[PDB]
Amino acid sequence: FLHVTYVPAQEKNFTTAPAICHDGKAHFPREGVFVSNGTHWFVTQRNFYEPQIITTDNTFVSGNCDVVIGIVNNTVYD
Amino acid sequence: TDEMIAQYTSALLAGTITSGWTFGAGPALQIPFPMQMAYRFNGIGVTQNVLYENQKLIANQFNSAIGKIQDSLSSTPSALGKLQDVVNHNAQALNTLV
Ligand SMILES: *[C@@H]1O[C@H](CO)[C@@H](O)[C@H](O)[C@H]1NC(C)=O
Ligand SMILES: *[C@@H]1O[C@H](CO)[C@@H](O)[C@H](O)[C@H]1NC(C)=O
Ligand SMILES: *[C@@H]1O[C@H](CO)[C@@H](O)[C@H](O)[C@H]1NC(C)=O
């Protein structure tokens, strides 16, 4: 059996947060995770790095800001 | 040796704790443990907000279950009986031969 498999490579480290605090609401990524390149926050898929602007389409609110541990302040675009 | 098998076990545990399942499919990729368990809830069909809102409770439940595992093993040695069975069988065979 010749198994063709996908192997990740060229890893890069980022600062990550569980949720984004916008106007009193927590925001969680619908798919992917929240990363930071030092000054700006993006949402990317887990296995590949394609940063995108955190918007309402790729985030769901589902809660408040105080309960979540590690939440950070950032704007969610509409 | 037993020490080498212990070191394999420790390496597997460290990789699982620090990198999730990434180290098994390639280079070990660092990730906070809560985010790893958020992925793991997302796999079983539960949204990650459930973990993040209930992080302390889930941590306490996991700690209690892990602590209870040792008492469960200690109370009933028969849980290891299968392993003991292996050893016993081998010994019996040799004794029969003698
Ligand atoms: C990534 O790794 C480098 C190592 O050179 C370190 O200096 C940095 O603090 C790490 N984190 C980020 C977000 O760059
Ligand atoms: C992070 O990315 C933004 C692009 O939105 C860029 O303007 C900024 O310079 C980057 N910061 C670093 C430290 O690379
Ligand atoms: C930034 O986050 C902190 C959480 O420690 C919160 O108290 C603060 O209100 C946030 N910023 C704004 C402008 O709301």
Angle B61-A68-B36 (CA atoms, 0-180°, nearest 5)?
A: 60
Q: Tell me how close the Cα of B32 comes to any Cα of chain A, in angstroms.
A: 9
Integer-rounded Cα radius of gyration of chain B: 20
> To one decimal place, what's the resolution in Å?
2.6
Task: Kindly determine whether residue A18 and residue B35, on different chains, have CB atoms separated by under 8 Å.
Answer: yes
- Give the DSSP letter of residue B19: H
The Cα A29–Cα B39 span in angstroms is: 11
The Cα A60–Cα A53 span in angstroms is: 14
The Cα A43–Cα A51 span in angstroms is: 6
Task: Kindly determine whether residue A13 and residue B47, on different chains, have CB atoms separated by under 8 Å.
Answer: no
The Cα B14–Cα A12 span in angstroms is: 20
Residues 6 or more apart from A34 whose CB is under 8 A from it?
Answer: A16, A17, A18, A19, A20, A41, A42, A43, A54, A72
**What method was applied to determine this entry?**
cryo-EM
Q: How many CB pairs under 8 A join A and B?
A: 42
Query: A42 in the Ramachandran plot: left (φ > 0), alpha (ψ -120 to 50) or beta?
Result: beta
Task: Report the separation in Å between the CA atom of A36 and the middle of ligand 1, taken as the mean of its atom positions.
Answer: 12
Environment class of B19 (CB within 10 Å of its CB; exposed 0-12, middle 13-18, buried 19+):
middle
DSSP-derived pairing of the beta strands A15-17 and A33-36: antiparallel
- Sign for the CA dihedral angle at A37, A40, A41, A47 comes to negative
The position carrying tokens 């390639």 is B26
